[PDB]
Amino acid sequence: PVPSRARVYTDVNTHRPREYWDYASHVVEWGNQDDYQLVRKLGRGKYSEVFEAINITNNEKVVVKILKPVKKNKIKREIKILENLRGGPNIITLADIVKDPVSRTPALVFEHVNNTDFKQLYQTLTDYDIRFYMYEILKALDYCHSMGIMHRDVKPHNVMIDHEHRKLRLIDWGLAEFYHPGQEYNVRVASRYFKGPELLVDYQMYDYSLDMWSLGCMLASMIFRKEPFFHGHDNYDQLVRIAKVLGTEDLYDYIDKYNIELDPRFNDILGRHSRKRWERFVHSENQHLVSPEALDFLDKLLRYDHQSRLTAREAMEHPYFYTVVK
Template identity: 30%
Template sequence: MGLLEAASEFKGAGPSSGPDRAGEWVFSPEAAGGKVTTVVATPGQGPDRPQEVSYTDIKVIGNGSFGVVYQARLIDSQEMVAIKKVLQDKRFKNRELQIMRKLDHCNIVRLRYFFYSSGEKKDEVYLNLVLDFVPETVYRVARHFNKAKTTIPIIYVKVYMYQLFRSLAYIHSQGVCHRDIKPQNLLVDPETAILKLCDFGSAKQLVRGEPNVSYICSRYYRAPELIFGATDYTSNIDIWSAGCVLAELLLGQPIFPGDSGVDQLVEIIKVLGTPTREQIREMNPNYTEFKFPQIKAHPWTKVFKPRTPPEAISLCSRLLEYTPVTRLSPLEACAHAFFDELRQPSTRLPSGRDLPLLFNFSPVELSIQPQLNSTLIPPHARAQTSPASHGTYERYPTPCPTTLLCLILVLSFIFSSGVDILKYSHL
């Protein structure tokens, strides 16, 4: 999410208007060598009690439109942390900071401290979020297996997706929608297989009746209601994105690629078929009068490789639904049969290590859908609570060229997107 777009949805006063401002960097990290940096920072959780925090070994590990991410080592504990530095508009409070301060879950990257620093330009202020450092992402893990011309072992798919759904259940119970679920935002420790959801730069506390921007979420993972321009969407957009992540891990490639909204809708319709008028109404009532060419749904079993576990296909089909309210809730997904193996006491990681803690549900989690608790917590784990074969497969076939071209023309008209029809001249 770009800084200008993010700022357009921010509300409230900026850091310079009150006691939120917690400290300044004593020097710029770009100039860091082996020096020790000491700042006055506020703890991420709990009372606002600024304290000195010192760190060293600073290096850039990521950057983008949001700002820069550094890796550093805390002097006191010798732990590695990530420091996300973003330009702060003084007129507004930072939504990412406000959300992260209220979140506390084992599958969400933890905000340890935050502080402000001055930029090179006059009156330029940066917000610095000191976060847990986790070395890998699901994206890089999957890419590693893809380069080896294999797919990620199914046990990892189960462990990663289960933890993702736990994190979503928690944030949704707090009224927060992440709005950018994708493999790059799923941090993983390759040794323990612990997953932590990160990057709440696009996240928002959704309030019924208040409009939201529809151009949110990264391409390939955008729910159809977003592509249709809905502004009254719910946290079910995160469920669609999670379904896309699951499908991608099973396929070894994105399930709904596309360079535009039209491209992506075409790919979605090739799998799910043309949405009914009622489904379109549920996504965005403004489009119910349009006549869409009829394309039949493609069988889910033919979308995936032949030896894909049936339970995985079943779960995908329950997540990737046109109608937002019919998608599984995060905890319903956790209770799905696809994850039954994780509930067996003998299950281990391929390395022989124990699974990460999967059933240490908090009272908050247990109160979300209590009717599921007996399924979610296997008997052996009650104390925790306070390779697929590859082979060839056929990608789903292209529907009738004439019908597909009609669909593309209708979608192009709806979105006035100026889609280059010549790119489909091979149909």
């Protein structure tokens, strides 16, 4: 089980104070619960409950996330991460933290973004809008990574966009974690369609590059107009779906390199697949969204080997964004 480390922001946490990354010893400075009045109910995440509210102190819109009682440790991990990234580029900003009378658990109050569902939205994005918004997501990722943080749940649903004002906000940091070289993480993060091969092959020593694969998954669906791009029926089939595209040769090279051994079941369903060129995923209805630079960029994001993927910053240096203004 060969070890690996991140090629960037490798030890950013190791040098910082302990109070920076040790969320277990963090003390929550609570605010006044009476300043917020809930209006309807937006989400029901099975890990939290999301409401649209109003800060009656200034009559302004806010989003309250009342967390379900699953582990004080996952809740203060999120709170510390949100406070560390407070003010970062396109990072959702935590405005307050109060105690909910009814649930008795913490309630996080955030600013307010007016996102219209991504299933009706990013199939209405022009080639230009895709590059634009992708560049905005990349700002968010580089910032949290430069801060020693992995989002680990990058997908269209955790990306709030205000198309009119062309604003973007990476949200839901409940799965976020701090990066420590050599640290082994739980492979049960992300959503099936956006899970990297490392997660699917059971390789626990991953890093920032995990978010990059998921970013590659989102791009692929936007430019090829195939949502989701890798459509697995379950986690095992998810890997086979990816192998039908990237091929099995590169998969073995990847697992061999790290001396990872697939579990037996992954060996009577995988098969033999050559890597296919992505012009095969190009047709009449998505043509206008594909260009040589888009394909080159996508190619560097979607690599089995997590060490070979473009870093968030390198990604922002790619020709693909030369067209995006300032």
